[PDB]
Design a protein around this nucleic acid. Structure first.
Lengths: 200, 92, 83, 108, 92, 101, 91, 79, 97
DNA sequence: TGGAGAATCCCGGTGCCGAGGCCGCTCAATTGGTCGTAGACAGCTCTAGCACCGCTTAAACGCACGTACGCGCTGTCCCCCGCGTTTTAACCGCCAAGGGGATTACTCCCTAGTCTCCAGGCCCGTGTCAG
DNA sequence: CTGACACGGCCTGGAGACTAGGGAGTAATCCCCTTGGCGGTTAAAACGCGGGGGACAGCGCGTACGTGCGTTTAAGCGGTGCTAGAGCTGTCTACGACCAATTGAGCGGCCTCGGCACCGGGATTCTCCA
C-alpha cells in the first residue's frame, strides 16, 4: 500500500527525530484484524554516548544494547518494576535513541480498557509508557522485529509545541536540564508539564 | 480526692479472714500490688492487641495476658475465676 | 508422631564448643547434663510463651514473631528477625 | 426505670468492675474496651488479693497477731513460690528478710 | 601439651559467628518440647533459628559467668556448682 | 496549594518525621501528639543510628571488608561502654562474641 | 510492610560512603530503630500520665531521652533534637 | 564528705541481715562505693522526674518511678 | 570473766537483724548523703521525708541482697569471711558496672 | 557431762493512738437509646511446611594413655571478733519563717478533624562487583 | 566464580489549608510541709587490746579430662510431592462509643475503744569452761 513509512523516513539525527515524531499516527496491527489509530503527544531523545542519562553512557557496549550498527530505526524494548517495558527507536549514529512516552487513541477504547488489567478516567487512560506498551501487547520477543516490514505496526501521516527539560533523571551531570522534550500546548492529557517553560 | 483499692481489699480480707484486720502500711502495700498487677495485665493485653491488629481489649486478651504473666497454678486458678465471672456476667 | 528424648541431640562436642566460645579452658564431666537441664528450662519458658502467643492469634504455625515477642517478654531482645 | 444493680454485684465480685473499666479506658491501652474485660480483670485482681491476704492472715495467726503488718505480707509472698516468682523484683517496705542462715556458718 | 589446643579452640570459636549446635537435633528438641503445650503444631524455619540464636547466646553468657565463678575459687575447671551459683545470682 | 516541602527536610533530618508522627498517633501513647515530638524523636533515632553505623564502619574497615555484617555491629555496640549499657539485654543474631581469655 | 531501610542507607552514605550493608545487618538496624522508638515513646507516655497531661510534646521526649540514654549519648541526643526542633520551627 | 556517715557498724548490721558471719576490713569502702553508685543512679532519675514537672522538691512518687524504671519496684509509698 | 567464742555473737546478731523489720542505717547521715548526691545534679533542691524514707528502704534492700549474693560467693570459695572480690564477682554476674 | 553467767520468753498491768465504724454528700457509675464500624464468618489462592530417598563426608563416638590439676592435710601468722571505756553526734521536741505545692479562673494558641492533591517509597527480574 | 545487592510504574499516605474547641500556660492566693537552729538526754559509734581462728601458701597424690586415632553414623544438601493453612477479601451484624438523666456508693471528716508496744519479775534454755 501507500500509507506506510519505510526505513528511509527515519534517516535523520536525534533532534529531527524529536521534531518529526510528533502528531503522527501509530497503528498497532493486532492479529484480530483491527486498528488502534493512536496519536503520540510527547517524545524523549537521548543523544548517544555523550549523554549521561542514556543507556550507552561512557562507551557502554552491553549485548542487549546492540541494535544500532546495522540499520537506523530499530525497534527496542527493555525491562523496567520487573514486568514493565518501554518503547525505543534507534536514531542515526551509535547510541542515539528516541523513547516513546504517551499517546491518545480514537477508537477501540474497550480493548485497552480491559486488556491493561492484570479509576478509569480519560486523562489517566493512556498516561504512562509501560501500561500503554502493555496495551499494544509488545513483549520482549519483539526486540528483533524491524520497524517497517511484514504486517506489523508502522507509521501513518497525520492531518503550539513547547520544549521542556529533563525530569526524573536526577540532579547531577550537565545533560539533565537541556530543553528538548516536545509537548503540544493546550492539551490537558499531558502527564508531565512545565509551568515555567510555557512562557519561554 | 484520691481513689484507692482500700474498701475492696478490706472486703476480701473480711471474707477470707473474718477476725483479722489490716494496718495502714499493709493497705498501702496491697493497693500498690493491685495497681502493679493491673498495669502489668493491661500492658500485656494492649501489646497482644497491637500485635494481632485488634483495636479492642476483650476477655480473651486479658485471659492470655494472665496466662503469660502469672506462674502456672496462679494462672490456672485466675483464668478459671475470670471465666466464671464473665459467664455469670453474661447469663445475668 | 511421638518424639522421644531428643535432649541427647545436644551432644558433648556442642557443649564444649559453646564453653570454648565462652572462654572455658577445662570442663567437668558433669557439666553436660546440667547444660541439658538449663537448655531444657530456657526452651520450655520461651516455647511456652511463643505457643501462647500463637494460640491467641488462632494459628497452628509458630512464627518468628512469637519467639521474638516471647524473648522480649523474658528480658532478652533478639534483633535480626523482624522485631 | 429499673433498679440499679452494680456490674460487680451481677458477676459476684467485690472488686469494682466499672472502676476497672474507667481505668482501662483512660489508661491508653486500646481505643475500645470490651464488656467482659473489666469483669475478667476484676476477678483476677480479686483472686490475687485473696491469695496474698489468706497467706498473710495465716502468718499473722502464726505470730499471735490480729492485724496484718508489712512483715506478714513479706513472709506470705516470699514463702509461696508462685507469689515470690511473680513479685521477685518487688521490694516490700518494712518487710525484712526471711530467717535463712547457711549450714556452713552454724557451729558443730 | 594439654591446654594449647583448648586455647586455640577458644581463639577460633570467638572469631567465628557460626552456629555451634547442629540444626536438626535442636529442631527435634524444640518440637519435642512444644508437644507438651499444644498438639500438632507447625513451626517456621525462622522460629527455630531464632530459638537457636537465643539458646546459643544464653549458654555462652552462662558459661562466661560460670568461668568467672570457677576462677573465683582458684581453679580452671568449671563444675556444676559454678553453674548453680551463677544461675542463682542471675536470679534464675 | 503552595510548594509541598517535606517536613523531614524542614528539620534537616533524614528519618521519616511524618511516619514517626503517625506511629506515635496510632501507637496509643497519648491522646494528642505535639508538633515537635516527631521531629525530636526522628533526630534522636537518626543520631543513634549514625553512631552505631560510625563504629560499625570502623569495625568493617579494621577487618579489611567493605560491607557491614552483624559481627561488625556486635563489635561496634560492645566495644563502646554507652551502647553496651543501652543494649545490655539485647542479643544480635549472627553477632558472635568478643575475644577475651 | 514498612521499614527504615532507605533511611539507614541515607545515613550510612552520609557517614561512610565507601561501605555497603547486608540484608541481615539492615534487619538488625530496623529492629534497633523500632526498639529505641518504642522505649522513648513508652517513657513519654508514662511521663504524660504521671503529670496528668494528654500531650506528648518535645519536653516529654527530651526527658525520656535523658532518662533512657546514658550520659554522653544523652547529651548529644538532646543537642541534636534541640537543633532539629529549632530549625523546624525557625522556618 | 558525708559517705563516712554510713558507718562501719551500719554496714556490719546490713551484712548481718544478709547472713554474713565474718567481714573483712576492706568491705566497708567497697560497700560505700556501691551504695554511692546506686544512690547516684536512682537520684539522677528522681531529679529528672522532678525537673520535668517543674518542681523544687523530690517526692516519694518520683523515687518510686525512678526505682520502677530500674526494675526495683518499691511497694508501700503510694501507687 | 565470761567471754563468748567468735561466732556466737555474730549468729545472735544474724537472728536479731533477720527477725526485725527496722531500718539499720541512721536516718540523718543518709539524709546528708542524699543531699550531697542531689546537689551534684540540681542545686537548691528540697526533699519530702517520704522520699528519703523510700530511698533508705530501697538502698537497704539492695545492700541486703548484695550481701546475700556476696555470702554465697564467699561460701563457694571455701570461706566464711567475705572480701571485696566477692562483691565484685556478685556485681559482675548480676550485670552491674 | 555439771555450774554459772548470760540471753530469751511468758505472763500481768498500762496507756496510747491508730484502726474501724457512722454520716453527709458529691461525683462517678448505671440505664436507656442510637449509630457507626470493628470484627466474626465464609471462601479462595497460593506460600510454604512436612514427609520421604539417597550420597558424600564431616562430625560424633568409643577407647587408650598420660599428665595437669583438683583436693586433702598441715603450719603459720595476720586479722578480725568481742568487750570495756571515752568521745561524739543522732534524735526528740518546739518555734518559726519562709518557700512552695496545690487549687482556681481565664484566655489563648495549638492540635485534632477533614478535603483535596500529589510526590516519596514500595514492588521487582538482570548489571555488575567482593569476597 | 557467583550470588547478594544496587540502579533502574503507581498509589496511598503525607502535606497544605481551614475550622474550632479544649488543654495547657499564667497570675494570684492559701496553708501544709520543709528547713534550720537550740536544748539535752543518751543511745550509739570510735578506739584500744588480747587472743583464737581462719585465710593462705606449700606439698603430695590419685584420678579424670585433654588429645589423638580409628570406626560409625546421621547431619546436610539436593530433589520431589502433597496439602494444611496463612493471608487476603467481601459482607453484614451486633457490640461498644457516646450522650443525657438518675442515683447511690465511696470518700472526707470525726468519734471512739481495743490491739499492741513497753516495763518488769521469774521461769527456761544457751553457751563456755572445767
Amino acid at each position: 500500500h501507500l500509507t506506510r513509512l519505510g526505513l528511509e523516513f527515519f534517516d535523520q539525527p536525534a533532534v529531527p527525530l524529536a521534531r518529526a515524531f510528533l502528531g503522527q499516527v501509530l497503528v498497532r496491527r493486532l492479529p484480530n484484524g483491527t486498528e488502534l489509530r493512536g496519536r503520540i503527544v510527547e517524545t524523549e531523545a537521548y543523544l548517544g554516548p555523550e549523554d549521561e542519562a542514556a543507556h550507552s553512557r561512557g562507551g557502554r557496549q552491553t549485548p542487549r544494547n546492540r541494535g544500532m550498527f546495522m540499520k537506523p530505526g530499530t525497534l527496542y524494548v527493555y525491562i523496567i518494576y520487573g514486568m514493565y517495558f518501554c518503547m525505543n527507536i534507534s536514531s542515526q549514529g551509535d547510541g542515539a535513541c528516541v523513547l516513546l512516552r504517551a499517546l491518545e487513541p480514537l477508537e477501540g477504547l474497550e480493548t485497552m480498557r480491559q486488556l491493561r488489567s492484570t479509576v478509569l478516567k480519560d486523562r489517566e487512560l493512556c498516561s504512562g509508557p509501560s501500561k500503554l506498551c502493555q496495551a499494544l501487547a509488545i513483549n520482549k520477543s519483539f526486540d528483533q522485529r524491524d520497524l517497517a516490514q511484514d504486517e506489523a505496526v508502522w507509521l501513518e501521516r497525520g492531518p503550539a509545541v513547547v520544549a521542556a527539560a529533563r525530569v526524573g533523571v536526577g540532579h547531577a551531570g550537565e545533560w539533565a536540564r537541556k530543553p528538548l522534550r516536545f509537548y503540544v500546548r493546550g492539551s490537558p492529557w499531558v502527564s508531565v508539564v512545565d509551568r515555567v517553560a510555557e512562557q519561554d | 480526692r484520691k481513689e484507692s483499692y482500700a474498701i475492696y481489699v478490706y472486703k476480701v480480707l473480711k471474707q477470707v479472714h473474718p477476725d483479722t484486720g489490716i494496718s495502714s502500711k499493709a493497705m498501702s502495700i496491697m493497693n500498690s500490688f493491685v495497681n502493679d498487677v493491673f498495669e502489668r495485665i493491661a500492658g500485656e493485653a494492649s501489646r497482644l492487641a497491637h500485635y494481632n491488629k485488634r483495636s479492642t481489649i476483650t476477655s480473651r486478651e486479658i485471659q492470655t495476658a494472665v496466662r503469660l504473666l502469672l506462674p502456672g497454678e496462679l494462672a490456672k486458678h485466675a483464668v478459671s475465676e475470670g471465666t466464671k465471672a464473665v459467664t455469670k456476667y453474661t447469663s445475668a | 508422631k511421638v518424639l522421644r528424648d531428643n535432649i541427647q541431640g545436644i551432644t558433648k562436642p556442642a557443649i564444649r564448643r559453646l564453653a570454648r566460645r565462652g572462654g572455658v579452658k577445662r570442663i567437668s564431666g558433669l557439666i553436660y547434663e546440667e547444660t541439658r537441664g538449663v537448655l531444657k528450662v530456657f526452651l520450655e519458658n520461651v516455647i511456652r510463651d511463643a505457643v501462647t502467643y500463637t494460640e491467641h492469634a488462632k494459628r497452628k504455625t509458630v512464627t518468628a514473631m512469637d519467639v521474638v515477642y516471647a524473648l522480649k517478654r523474658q528480658g532478652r531482645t533478639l534483633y535480626g528477625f523482624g522485631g | 426505670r429499673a433498679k440499679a444493680k452494680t456490674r460487680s454485684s451481677r458477676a459476684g465480685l467485690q472488686f469494682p468492675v466499672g472502676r476497672v473499666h474507667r481505668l482501662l479506658r483512660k489508661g491508653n491501652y486500646a481505643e475500645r474496651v470490651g464488656a467482659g474485660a473489666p469483669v475478667y480483670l476484676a476477678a483476677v485482681l480479686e483472686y490475687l488479693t485473696a491469695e496474698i491476704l489468706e497467706l498473710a492472715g495465716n502468718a499473722a495467726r502464726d505470730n499471735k497477731k490480729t492485724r496484718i503488718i508489712p512483715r506478714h505480707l513479706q513472709l506470705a509472698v516470699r514463702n509461696d513460690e508462685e507469689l515470690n516468682k511473680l513479685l521477685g523484683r518487688v521490694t516490700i517496705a518494712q518487710g525484712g528478710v526471711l530467717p535463712n542462715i547457711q549450714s556452713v556458718l552454724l557451729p558443730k | 601439651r594439654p591446654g594449647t589446643v583448648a586455647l586455640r579452640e577458644i581463639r577460633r570459636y570467638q572469631k567465628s559467628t557460626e552456629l555451634l549446635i547442629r540444626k536438626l537435633p535442636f529442631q527435634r528438641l524444640v518440637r519435642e518440647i512444644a508437644q507438651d503445650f499444644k498438639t500438632d503444631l507447625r513451626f517456621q524455619s525462622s522460629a527455630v533459628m531464632a530459638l537457636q540464636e537465643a539458646s546459643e547466646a544464653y549458654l555462652v553468657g552462662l558459661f562466661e559467668d560460670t568461668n568467672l565463678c570457677a576462677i573465683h575459687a582458684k581453679r580452671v575447671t568449671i563444675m556444676p556448682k559454678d553453674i548453680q551459683l551463677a544461675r542463682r545470682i542471675r536470679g534464675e
